[PDB]
Design a protein around this ligand. Structure first.
Ligand SMILES: O=C(O)CCCn1c2ccccc2c2ccccc21
Length: 131
């Protein structure tokens, strides 16, 4: 994946509070996270992909190789087992913790980067555009 490379700003978000709630995010965290308009910076150095998220809420960063499981501390402080693959141009990211699972799909659509977050019956869609 490298059509994903760049700096991306959040411009729209749907159902993100519902999603965080379903994931188990406490109210105090949802409040600040929900108002957040993060900048997402994606870069690639060989087989290592780095995704940063910067906002007044929290700075986070993951570095990974496609198809190799890694430990992630999420923005909401979950300790999860993450695996990311590239599937028909789609970056598919699964987080597993406590017998639960959530999926984040990042895809390129026109000049948008579209992020779909799924937890149980809840689907949240977030759109980023180049900074
Ligand atoms: O990438 C996204 O836009 C949503 C998935 C990752 N993510 C955040 C990104 C920016 C700000 C807060 C959060 C957040 C909060 C809880 C869980 C996942 C989260």
């Amino acid at each position: 994946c490298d059509a994903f490379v760049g700096t991306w700003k959040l411009v729209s978000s749907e159902n993100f509070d519902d999603y965080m709630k379903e994931v188990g995010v406490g109210f105090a965290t949802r409040k600040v996270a929900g108002m957040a308009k993060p900048n997402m910076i994606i870069s690639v150095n060989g087989d290592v992909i780095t995704i940063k998220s910067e906002s007044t809420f929290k700075n986070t960063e993951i570095s990974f190789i496609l198809g190799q499981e890694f430990d992630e501390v999420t923005a909401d402080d979950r300790k999860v087992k993450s695996t990311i693959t590239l599937d028909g141009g789609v970056l598919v990211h699964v987080q597993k913790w406590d017998g639960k699972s959530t999926t984040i799909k990042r895809k390129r659509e026109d000049d948008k980067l579209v992020v779909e977050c799924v937890m149980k019956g809840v689907t949240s869609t977030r759109v980023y555009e180049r900074a």
